Design a binder for this molecule. Structure first.
Ligand SMILES: [Mg+2]
Ligand SMILES: [Mg+2]
Ligand SMILES: [Zn+2]
Ligand SMILES: [Zn+2]
Lengths: 50, 468, 1167
C-alpha cells in the first residue's frame, strides 16, 4: 500500500517475491538437536546437506 | 411407496413391448406424419420466397453454405445450379393464377421437397407460419367479438355468408340490410372492425393467399406434427427397458441410477429422431449406441464437483488399467515414473493429472473422537487479517502522516504524490512536475533529499520499528 | 418525524413464509449451472454455484477478470465480468436463487409430523403423496357436476368422469395441483363455514376436532401468509463461502456437502427445462419431476425419504436442516458453546499465602493473555515507539516489560473456572498475582466451592476486557463478594480440612501440660508463653480477656473478665474482631463450630470484617497444624482387644441357627434373614467397641491419681474435628468392614470379617470388588443423571427474574417445623429465616405485635420469635407473588452471597435451578435421585389413592362391573357425582361418612394433580417441597426451601378456563395472561364474565415446552418442528427472554442488562 511503499523507499529494502515459511522452534520448548532427516522426492536434486 | 425408482419401474411396466412387425407400424406412421408437414411446408409461398431471399444472402457472402442446407435429395457448384431450378419452377407457377394454376403449383412443391434444410431455418419457417397465423387469428377474433359480443349478433348467421370470404364487405355492410333483429345493430362498430381488416387482407398480399387457404395449411401441418410426436412418443415408451438395461452398467461411476437412465432416456429420444427403418437395422441394436453415447457424455460432463474436460477422463482411465497388470507383475505396484513410460504423453504430467483427478473430501467428514468434531471445523481462515496487524495499519498512517507534516508543505505534497498516500493511485514523476509548473529533474531531486531527511534518526527512530 | 430505512439497532424478529418474488428480492442472480471452479485456473465459473457475478469477488476489492484491480474502484461493475469490486466478505452474505421449471413441495410443510399442507387442506398425507408422485388425479373446484372439491380419482376414473363432463370441472395431479388447491382455497369463506358447523351439530366427538381446525386457519389468515407459498417456485441458494471449496495441503480440495446437493437439484432442474422443449412423453417428464422433487427434499432436510448418501462416501451428505439441527437443537448455542479468545488453562496448585481475594497466575500465561493491553501500556509511557516495536519487545521478553505488566495486572480481575460448572460459584473473579512457573495457584478456602481437589484438575482463566466486564467481575463475581452459598445462607468459604485440624488441635485441652494452672494478662503474653516453650498449647488456664458486645444501640460495649480457658484458645482470641464473645472460641473448635463462627461474624459485623477474618483463620490453621506434627502411623489405628471374641460369638449364633435349619426348626428364607441380622448386629458391636476404646482410652494423670479424656491419637483428631474421615470409614480401618453385596444386591450372609489394618484374603477382596465398581459406575452414571436434571430445571425456569419490588399481596404459606414422626427433623428458624412475613405475628398473648406485617426475618427477629414460644408463621413465597411475569422482591426472600434482601433484577430462576441440581451427585439410586425427578415431573404413581371429589355424604351405587360406582351427595349443592372405582383395591373410606373434599378415600400414594385440584395450590406446593426436601435432607444436603418453591411456581404457570366472555373456554393458558385480563374486565369493557379458570400442574419438562419465544424453543426442543410450526403463523419473537438474547448476542434482559432492556422495552409502544 502507499505508506508501505513509502516505507520501502525510505529504508531502501527490496521487497522479495518470496515469503518465509521456515520451520521454527515452538514458543517455550527448548532442547538439543540430536538428529536430522531429509526425505526427498525421486528426481529432485539433493541439496548440499542432504 | 415413495422411492422414485419404484414408481418409475411401475409406471413404465405398463407399456407393453413391441412385436418385430409392430416396430415398423409406428415407424411407418412417423414417415407419414413428417411427410405431411413437409408437404404442408412446401405449399407456403412465403416459405419459398424466403428461401430465395436467404440464398441471395448466401451468394452475397452474407451467410455460409452450412447455415441454410444440410444437402438435398440428390458442392458449391451443385448448390448454385439446384437453387436456379427452384427459382425457375417458381416463376412459371407464379403468374398462372388466372384456377388452371393448380397444375403448376403442384410442381413448385416437388422441387422444394428435395431440400433438407438446416433445422434452425426450418423451425423459423414453422415459427413464421404460426406467427403469421397468430397474426390472422388476432384479426379473426377482433371482427367476431366486436360483432357478436358487442353489437349483439348471433354466430349462427354470422358464419353463413362468411365461409369462402372473411375479407370482402359481403359480410360487413351487406348483411346489415337483411333487416334481421341483429342486422341494423352492426353499424355502430363499423369504424373499428373494417380498419383492422387492413392487416387481415394484407396477409393475403404478403403470403399471397386468401384467409381461406391460410387456415388449412398449417392446420394440416399441425396434424402431421402432432402425428409425428404421437408415433415418436409411442416408440420411446416401448424402449425404456433398453435404457435401463444399458444404464445398469454405469451405476457407481458417480451418478445416480435415475440420473443415468434419464440422460440415457434422452439418448433413446435422439435415436428415434434419426432412425430409418429402411436401412434394415433392428431398432434395438441401433439405439444402444445413442443411449450409451448419452450416458457417458453426461457422466463425463456433470458427475464431478470440479468439471474436467473429456480427454482428461480418458487419460485417467488408461492409468488405472496399466497399474493393474503392473500391480502384481511388479509385485508391489509401479513407481510414479513407471506408468509414465507406459503412457504416450510427457509422463511428468502424470503428477499434474493425478492432482486434479482427486474428488474433494466432504468438509463434514467426521474426524477423530466422533465428537461432531468435523474436518471443516479445523479449516482456518487465511484471508483474515489478525488484529495485531490491522492495529499496526491504523498506526502506520498516524506514523507516516506525522512525519509528513514535519517536512515542508511541498515535500509532503511531493511524497504523498509519488506514492498513493491518502490519494487514489500514484503519479509518475513527470505528472508531478507539471502540476508544480517547475518540472522534471528538479522534482526528482527534492524527493531524494526528502527520503534522506527521514533516513537519519530523530525522524528515523519511529518508522524503523515497522521492519522485522 | 421520519421513520428509518438503513441499519438501526433492531428490536424484535419476524418469521414467515417466503414468496417466490420475496426469494427473488434476496437473490443477486440465478445459479444456472452446476459448475464450481475452472479445473485449472481455480477461479469460479460464471455462473455457477460459485460465481463472482452473482455472489462476490474471490479476493478483496479486486475484479475477477482483473481489469479493475485498484482499491479506489468500489461501486464499479467490471464491463468484462460484471463483478462489483468490494470486500470478499460479500461472498459470505449475498444469496442467489434457482427458477424451478415445475413447482416443488417443501418437505418441512409436507413432512413435519402434523402435515401442515395436509390439515390446511383437511386432506390426508398419504393421498397428497399419492397426488405428488402422479399416482392419482385430484379434483379442484369441482363445480356442479358429480365430484367433491378434494376428491381423488385414478387414471381410468378421471377418463370416465371426463367423457361425461369435459369442462366446468377441473382436476390436476402433482405439485401444480396442490399449489392450485392452496391458491383456490378461500380461508375467509371456509372460516365462516366452520363457525356455523360448530354451533349446528352439538357433539364432543365432532366439535372437539372441529374447533382445533378453525382457530388454526384464522391464525394463518391473520398471519398474512398465502397458502401457495408452501409450494416452491423459486429456491434460494446459500452464499458460497458458507459452503466453501477451500483448498488443503498436498493440493487437495475439501467442500461442504451442500454443493453435491445443490449441484444435483440444478442438474435435474436444468434437465427438466430441456425436457419441456423436447416435448418428451409424459412418462419421462413425470419421472424427471419426481426426481427433482426428491432432490430438493434431499437438499432441504435429508432423511425424511431414503436418505441419499454423498458421492463415493457411504456417509449421508448433510443437508440444511441438519446444519441448524443437532444435539440438542442448535450446535451454536449447545455446549459447546463457542470458543473464546483471551483464555487459557493449566494444572492448579495451592498457594496458601494468597489472600482470599487473589490467585497465583503464571508469568508467561499473564504475558500472552494481556498482550494487547501490554502493547497499549508500553506505548502509553513511550517505552516502545510503536505497537510493532512493542510486539518485538514482549517477543524479545525484555526485562523492562515485567514492571509494566504489574501495572496492567494490578486492579484487573481474571475469571477462574473449573470443569463441571454447576452453581454460580463455579466461576469466580480473582486479582492476579504473578507467579514463576506454569501452575495456577488457588486460594485454599475456595477449593470447596469449586469442588476442586488437587489430583491434577485443571482450571481455565478468562480476562474481563471491557470496563463493564471488569466491574462486573469485581462487584459480582469477585471471590470476596460470595462467601455464602446462594443455595443455603451458610458460608461456603468454611475452612476445609488441614485448617480445621489445625484449629481443632489448637483449641483442645489435655489434663496436665506445661503451664497448667497459671494466669496471664492477655493473649499477647499467652503466645509469648507458648512460643518460648514455657506453656503447652493445651493446658487449662485463666487469663484476662477483653471481649466486646455491640448490644447497645449500634454501639460497642466492652467487658473484661477472667475466663477459664486454655493457652491455644487464648492465643486464637487475637484474631477475633471486636464484638464477638469469647464464648465462641472457648470450646474445642471442630469443623462444625468453625463454620458457624464465620457465619455469625458475617451476620454481625458485616462482610469486610468477615473476609479478613477468614484469611486469618486459614493462616493460623495451617501454621499451628504444621506445628502440631500430626501424622498417621500404622499403630494409630487401634483394633479393639475384644474383636476376635465378638466374631466368635456371632460365629456361634450362625451355627445355632444352622442347627435349627438342618433340623427344620427354621425355614430356609428365615435362615437367610436371621444370619444376616446377627452378622449386622455384630458389625455394630465391633464398631462401637473400637469407637469407645479409640475415643477416650487415653488415660492420663494430673498431680493426683488417674483420669481419662478424649484421645489425642492422630486418626481420631481428624474425625472428631471434622477434618477428614467419619466413623463409618474408620470402622473399615480398625473394626471389621461391613457385609458386601453380590451383584444381585442380596447381601452375603458371611460378611468381611477383616479390615484394612489387617490383610484381606483372596475371597474378601474379590467380594469387595463389586461394591467399588458398582459405586464408580453408579456415581459415574449419577453424574449423568444430575446434569440432565439441572438442564430440565434451568430450561423451565431461566427467564424468571425479579422484576417488581412488592407485589403487595398479604398472601403467603404457613411455615411450621417439619416434625417427621420423631423430633424436629428441621427447626422452624431454618425454614423461615430470610423470608418475609405475610402478616404481623402475635405473642401467645395478644394486643402484641411482635413482627409488624411484612418484615424480613433476620437472626434477631428469628431469635425474638424463639424467645417466645411462637409455633407457626405465614410467609410470602414466590408461588404466591402477585407480580406477573416475575417475582416481587418481597415475596422471594433475602438470600444471596450477601445477606441483604434480593436486589431488583437478579435472575433467580437460574440460581434456584443451579442450587437444586448441584448437590444431586450425593443422592442414591422409594428413594434417591430418580425419586426427585418423579416429583418434578408431576408423574402419577402406579396405584394411586383417590380423594373425595366434593364435600358431603357419599354412598355406593350399582355393583361390581369391573368398577363399582361411588356417589357423593352434598346437602345443599348438587348430588350428581358417581365415580367408577375398581373395587378390588382395598378401601379405607368409611362407607357411611360425609367426607371433607380431599380426604383419603383409599390408601396408596396420590397424584399431585389431585392435591392441586382438590386441596389447593398451597397444599400441593407444601407437598412437593416437603417430599423433595425429605430426599435431600436424608443425605445431609441443605437446600433452602425457596429454590424448590420457584420451580413449583413454574410448574403451575398455566391454567384452564371455566367461564367465558372473552377467552376460549377450554383453552389451557398462562395464568399470568388470564389474571392481567380479568383485571381488564373487572373494571374495563364488559364484565364478561368472567372468566373463572383452574390452575393446572405441569411437569417441569412439559412446562418448559411452552415458551413464548420460538428462538428459545428452537434451542432445546426439536428444531424442525419448532421452525415449521412457527413459520406458518408468522410468529413475531420480541426477544425479552434470556435464552434468545444469548443467541442473538445482546445484553441479557437481566442483571446489569435489566436496566437496559427496561429502558428499551418502554421505548417501544410509544412515540
Ligand atoms: Mg474435594
Ligand atoms: Mg480431580
Ligand atoms: Zn472483470
Ligand atoms: Zn409476590
Amino acid at each position: 500500500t502507499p505508506e508501505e511503499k513509502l516505507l520501502r523507499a525510505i529504508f531502501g529494502e527490496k521487497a522479495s517475491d518470496v515469503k518465509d515459511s521456515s520451520l521454527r522452534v515452538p514458543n517455550g520448548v527448548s532442547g538439543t538437536v540430536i538428529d536430522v532427516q531429509v526425505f526427498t522426492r525421486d528426481g529432485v536434486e539433493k541439496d548440499k546437506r542432504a | 411407496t415413495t422411492d422414485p425408482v419404484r414408481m418409475y419401474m411401475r409406471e413404465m411396466g405398463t407399456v407393453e413391448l413391441l412385436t418385430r412387425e409392430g416396430e415398423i407400424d409406428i415407424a411407418k406412421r412417423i414417415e407419414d406424419g413428417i411427410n405431411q408437414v413437409q408437404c404442408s411446408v412446401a405449399e407456403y409461398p412465403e416459405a419459398i420466397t424466403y428461401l430465395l431471399e436467404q440464398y441471395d444472402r448466401v451468394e452475397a457472402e452474407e451467410a455460409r453454405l452450412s447455415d441454410l442446407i444440410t444437402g438435398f435429395v440428390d458442392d458449391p457448384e451443385l448448390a448454385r445450379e439446384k437453387f436456379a431450378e427452384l427459382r425457375a419452377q417458381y416463376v412459371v407457377t407464379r403468374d398462372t393464377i388466372k384456377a388452371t394454376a393448380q397444375e403448376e403449383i403442384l410442381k413448385l412443391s416437388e422441387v422444394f421437397k428435395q431440400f433438407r434444410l438446416v433445422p434452425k431455418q426450418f423451425d423459423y419457417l414453422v415459427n413464421s407460419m404460426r406467427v403469421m397465423m397468430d397474426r390472422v387469428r388476432t384479426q379473426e377474433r377482433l371482427i367476431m367479438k366486436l360483432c357478436v359480443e358487442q353489437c349483439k349478433m348471433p354466430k349462427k348467421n354470422f358464419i353463413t355468408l362468411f365461409t369462402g370470404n372473411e375479407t370482402s364487405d359481403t359480410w360487413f355492410n351487406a348483411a346489415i340490410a337483411m333487416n334481421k333483429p341483429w342486422s341494423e345493430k352492426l353499424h355502430d362498430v363499423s369504424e373499428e372492425v373494417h380498419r383492422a381488416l387492413q392487416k387481415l387482407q394484407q396477409i393475403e398480399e404478403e403470403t399471397g393467399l386468401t384467409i381461406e387457404q391460410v387456415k388449412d395449411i398449417n392446420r394440416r401441418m399441425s396434424i402431421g406434427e402432432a402425428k409425428a410426436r404421437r408415433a415418436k412418443k409411442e416408440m420411446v415408451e416401448a424402449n425404456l427397458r433398453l435404457v435401463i438395461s444399458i444404464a445398469k452398467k454405469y451405476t457407481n461411476r458417480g451418478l445416480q441410477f435415475l440420473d443415468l437412465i434419464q440422460e440415457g432416456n434422452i439418448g433413446l429420444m435422439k435415436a428415434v429422431d434419426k432412425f430409418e427403418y429402411r436401412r434394415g437395422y433392428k431398432f434395438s441394436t441401433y439405439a444402444t449406441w445413442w443411449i450409451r453415447q448419452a450416458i457417458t457424455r453426461s457422466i463425463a460432463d456433470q458427475a464431478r464437483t470440479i468439471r474436467i474436460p473429456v480427454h482428461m477422463i480418458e487419460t485417467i482411465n488408461k492409468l488405472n488399467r496399466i497399474s493393474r497388470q503392473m500391480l502384481q507383475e511388479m509385485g508391489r505396484e509401479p513407481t510414479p515414473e513407471e506408468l509414465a513410460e507406459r503412457m504416450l504423453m510427457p509422463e511428468d504430467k502424470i503428477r499434474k493429472v493425478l492432482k486434479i483427478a482427486k474428488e474433494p473430501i466432504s468438509m463434514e467428514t467426521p474426524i477423530g473422537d466422533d465428537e461432531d468434531s468435523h474436518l471443516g471445523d479445523f479449516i482456518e481462515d487465511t484471508t483474515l487479517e489478525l488484529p495485531l496487524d490491522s492495529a499496526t495499519t491504523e498506526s502506520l498512517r498516524a506514523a507516516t502522516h506525522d512525519v509528513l507534516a514535519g517536512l515542508t508543505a511541498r515535500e509532503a505534497k511531493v511524497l504523498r504524490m509519488r506514492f498513493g498516500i491518502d490519494m487514489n493511485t500514484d503519479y509518475t514523476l513527470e505528472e508531478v512536475g507539471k502540476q508544480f509548473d517547475v518540472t522534471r529533474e528538479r522534482i526528482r531531486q527534492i524527493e531524494a533529499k526528502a527520503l534522506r531527511k527521514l533516513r537519519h534518526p530523530s525522524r528515523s527512530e519511529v518508522l524503523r520499528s515497522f521492519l522485522d | 418525524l421520519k421513520a428509518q430505512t438503513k441499519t438501526e439497532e433492531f428490536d424484535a424478529i419476524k418469521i414467515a413464509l417466503a414468496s417466490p418474488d420475496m426469494i427473488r428480492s434476496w437473490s443477486f442472480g440465478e445459479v444456472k449451472k452446476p459448475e464450481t471452479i475452472n479445473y485449472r485456473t481455480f477461479k469460479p465459473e460464471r455462473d455457477g454455484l460459485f460465481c463472482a457475478r452473482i455472489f462476490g469477488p474471490v479476493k478483496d476489492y479486486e475484479c475477477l477478470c482483473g481489469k479493475y484491480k485498484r482499491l479506489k474502484h468500489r461501486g464499479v461493475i467490471c464491463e468484462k465480468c460484471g463483478v462489483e469490486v468490494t470486500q470478499t466478505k460479500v461472498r459470505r452474505e449475498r444469496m442467489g436463487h434457482i427458477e424451478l421449471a415445475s413447482p416443488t413441495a417443501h418437505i418441512w410443510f409436507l413432512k413435519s409430523l402434523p402435515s401442515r399442507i395436509g390439515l390446511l387442506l383437511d386432506m390426508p398425507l398419504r393421498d397428497i403423496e399419492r397426488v405428488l408422485y402422479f399416482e392419482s388425479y385430484v379434483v379442484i373446484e369441482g363445480g356442479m357436476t358429480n365430484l367433491e372439491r378434494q376428491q381423488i380419482l385414478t387414471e381410468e376414473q378421471y377418463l370416465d368422469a371426463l367423457e361425461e363432463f369435459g369442462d366446468e370441472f377441473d382436476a390436476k395431479m402433482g405439485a401444480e395441483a396442490i399449489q392450485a388447491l392452496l391458491k383456490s382455497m378461500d380461508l375467509e369463506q371456509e372460516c365462516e363455514q366452520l363457525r356455523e358447523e360448530l354451533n349446528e351439530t352439538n357433539s364432543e366427538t365432532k366439535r372437539k376436532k372441529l374447533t382445533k381446525r378453525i382457530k388454526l386457519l384464522e391464525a394463518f389468515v391473520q398471519s398474512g401468509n398465502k397458502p401457495e407459498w408452501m409450494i416452491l417456485t423459486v429456491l434460494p441458494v446459500l452464499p458460497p463461502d458458507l459452503r466453501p471449496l477451500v483448498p488443503l495441503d498436498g493440493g487437495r480440495f475439501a467442500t461442504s456437502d451442500l454443493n453435491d446437493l445443490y449441484r444435483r437439484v440444478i442438474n435435474r432442474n436444468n434437465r427438466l427445462k430441456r425436457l419441456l422443449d423436447l416435448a418428451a412423453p409424459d412418462i419421462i417428464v413425470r419421472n424427471e419431476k419426481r426426481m427433482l422433487q426428491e432432490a430438493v427434499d434431499a437438499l432441504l432436510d435429508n432423511g425424511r425419504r431414503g436418505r441419499a448418501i454423498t458421492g463415493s462416501n457411504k456417509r449421508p451428505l448433510k443437508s440444511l436442516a441438519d446444519m441448524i439441527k443437532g444435539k440438542q437443537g442448535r450446535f451454536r448455542q449447545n455446549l459447546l458453546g463457542k470458543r473464546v479468545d483471551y483464555s487459557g488453562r493449566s494444572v492448579i496448585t495451592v498457594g496458601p499465602y494468597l489472600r482470599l481475594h487473589q490467585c497465583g497466575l503464571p508469568k508467561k500465561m499473564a504475558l500472552e493473555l494481556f498482550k494487547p493491553f501490554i502493547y497499549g501500556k508500553l506505548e502509553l509511557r513511550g517505552l516502545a515507539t510503536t505497537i510493532k516495536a512493542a510486539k518485538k519487545m514482549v517477543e524479545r521478553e525484555e526485562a523492562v516489560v515485567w514492571d509494566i505488566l504489574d501495572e496492567v495486572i494490578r486492579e484487573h480481575p481474571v475469571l477462574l473456572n473449573r470443569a463441571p460448572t454447576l452453581h454460580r460459584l463455579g466461576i469466580q473473579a480473582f486479582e492476579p498475582v504473578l507467579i514463576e512457573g506454569k501452575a495456577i495457584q488457588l486460594h485454599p478456602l475456595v477449593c470447596a466451592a469449586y469442588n476442586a481437589d488437587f489430583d491434577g484438575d485443571q482450571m481455565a482463566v478468562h480476562v474481563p476486557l471491557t470496563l463493564e466486564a471488569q466491574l462486573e467481575a469485581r462487584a459480582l463475581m469477585m471471590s470476596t463478594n460470595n462467601i455464602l452459598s446462594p443455595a443455603n445462607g451458610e458460608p461456603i468459604i468454611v475452612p476445609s480440612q488441614d485448617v480445621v485440624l489445625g484449629l481443632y488441635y489448637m483449641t483442645r485441652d489435655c489434663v496436665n501440660a506445661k503451664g497448667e494452672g497459671m494466669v496471664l494478662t492477655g493473649p499477647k503474653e499467652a503466645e509469648r508463653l507458648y512460643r518460648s516453650g514455657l506453656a503447652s498449647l493445651h493446658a487449662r488456664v485463666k487469663v484476662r480477656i477483653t471481649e466486646y458486645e455491640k448490644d447497645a444501640n449500634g454501639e460497642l460495649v466492652a467487658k473484661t473478665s477472667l475466663k477459664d480457658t486454655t493457652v491455644g484458645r487464648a492465643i486464637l482470641w487475637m484474631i477475633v474482631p471486636k464484638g464477638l464473645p469469647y464464648s465462641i472460641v472457648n470450646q474445642a473448635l471442630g469443623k462444625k463450630a468453625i463454620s458457624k463462627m464465620l457465619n455469625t461474624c458475617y451476620r454481625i459485623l458485616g462482610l469486610k470484617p468477615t473476609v479478613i477474618f477468614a484469611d486469618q483463620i486459614m493462616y493460623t490453621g495451617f501454621a499451628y497444624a504444621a506445628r502440631s506434627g500430626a501424622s498417621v502411623g500404622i499403630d494409630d489405628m487401634v483394633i479393639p482387644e475384644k474383636k476376635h471374641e465378638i466374631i466368635s460369638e456371632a460365629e456361634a449364633e450362625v451355627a445355632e441357627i444352622q442347627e435349627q435349619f438342618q433340623s427344620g426348626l427354621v425355614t430356609a428364607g428365615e435362615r437367610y434373614n436371621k444370619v444376616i441380622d446377627i452378622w449386622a448386629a455384630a458389625n455394630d458391636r465391633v464398631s462401637k467397641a473400637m469407637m469407645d476404646n479409640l475415643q477416650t482410652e487415653t488415660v492420663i494423670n494430673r498431680d493426683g491419681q488417674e483420669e481419662k479424656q478424649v484421645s489425642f491419637n492422630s486418626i481420631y483428631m481428624m474425625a472428631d474435628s471434622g477434618a477428614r474421615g467419619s466413623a463409618a470409614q474408620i470402622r473399615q480401618l480398625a473394626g471389621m468392614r461391613g457385609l458386601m453385596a453380590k451383584p444381585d444386591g442380596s447381601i452375603i450372609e458371611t460378611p468381611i470379617t477383616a479390615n484394612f489394618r489387617e490383610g484381606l484374603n483372596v475371597l474378601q477382596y474379590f467380594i469387595s470388588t463389586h461394591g467399588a465398581r458398582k459405586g464408580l459406575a453408579d456415581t459415574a452414571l449419577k453424574t449423568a443423571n444430575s446434569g440432565y436434571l439441572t438442564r430440565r430445571l434451568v430450561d423451565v425456569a431461566q427467564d424468571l427474574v425479579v422484576t417488581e419490588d412488592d407485589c403487595g399481596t398479604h398472601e403467603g404459606i404457613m411455615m411450621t417445623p417439619v416434625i417427621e414422626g420423631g423430633d424436629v427433623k428441621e427447626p422452624l428458624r431454618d425454614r423461615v429465616l430470610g423470608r418475609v412475613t405475610a402478616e404481623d405475628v402475635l405473642k401467645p398473648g395478644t394486643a402484641d405485635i411482635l413482627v409488624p406485617r411484612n418484615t424480613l426475618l433476620h437472626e434477631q427477629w428469628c431469635d425474638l420469635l424463639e424467645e417466645n414460644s411462637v409455633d407457626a408463621v405465614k410467609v410470602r413465597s414466590v408461588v404466591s407473588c402477585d407480580t406477573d411475569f416475575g417475582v416481587c422482591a418481597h415475596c422471594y426472600g433475602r438470600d444471596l452471597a450477601r445477606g441483604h434482601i434480593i436486589n431488583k433484577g437478579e435472575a433467580i430462576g437460574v440460581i434456584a435451578a443451579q442450587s437444586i441440581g448441584e448437590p444431586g451427585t450425593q443422592l442414591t439410586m422409594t428413594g434417591g435421585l430418580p425419586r426427585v425427578a418423579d416429583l418434578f415431573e408431576a408423574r402419577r404413581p402406579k396405584e394411586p389413592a383417590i380423594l373425595a371429589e366434593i364435600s358431603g355424604i357419599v354412598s355406593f351405587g350399582k355393583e361390581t362391573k369391573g368398577k363399582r360406582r361411588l356417589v357423593i351427595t352434598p346437602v345443599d349443592g348438587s348430588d350428581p357425582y358417581e365415580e367408577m372405582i375398581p373395587k378390588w383395591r382395598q378401601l379405607n373410606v368409611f362407607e357411611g361418612e360425609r367426607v371433607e373434599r380431599g380426604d383419603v378415600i383409599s390408601d396408596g400414594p396420590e397424584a399431585p394433580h389431585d392435591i392441586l385440584r382438590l386441596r389447593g395450590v398451597h397444599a400441593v406446593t407444601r407437598y412437593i417441597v416437603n417430599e423433595v426436601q425429605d430426599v435431600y435432607r436424608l443425605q445431609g444436603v441443605k437446600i433452602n426451601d425457596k429454590h424448590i418453591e420457584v420451580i413449583v411456581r413454574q410448574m403451575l404457570r398455566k391454567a384452564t378456563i371455566v367461564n367465558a366472555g372473552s377467552s376460549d373456554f377450554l383453552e389451557g393458558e398462562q395464568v399470568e395472561y388470564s389474571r392481567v385480563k380479568i383485571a381488564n374486565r373487572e373494571l374495563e369493557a364488559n364484565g364478561k364474565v368472567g372468566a373463572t379458570y383452574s390452575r393446572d400442574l405441569l411437569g417441569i419438562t412439559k412446562a418448559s415446552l411452552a415458551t413464548e419465544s420460538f428462538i428459545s424453543a428452537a434451542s432445546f426442543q426439536e428444531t424442525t418442528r419448532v421452525l415449521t410450526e412457527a413459520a406458518v403463523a408468522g410468529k413475531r419473537d420480541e426477544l425479552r427472554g434470556l435464552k434468545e438474547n444469548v443467541i442473538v448476542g445482546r445484553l441479557i434482559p437481566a442483571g446489569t442488562g435489566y436496566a437496559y432492556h427496561q429502558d428499551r422495552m418502554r421505548r417501544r409502544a410509544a412515540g
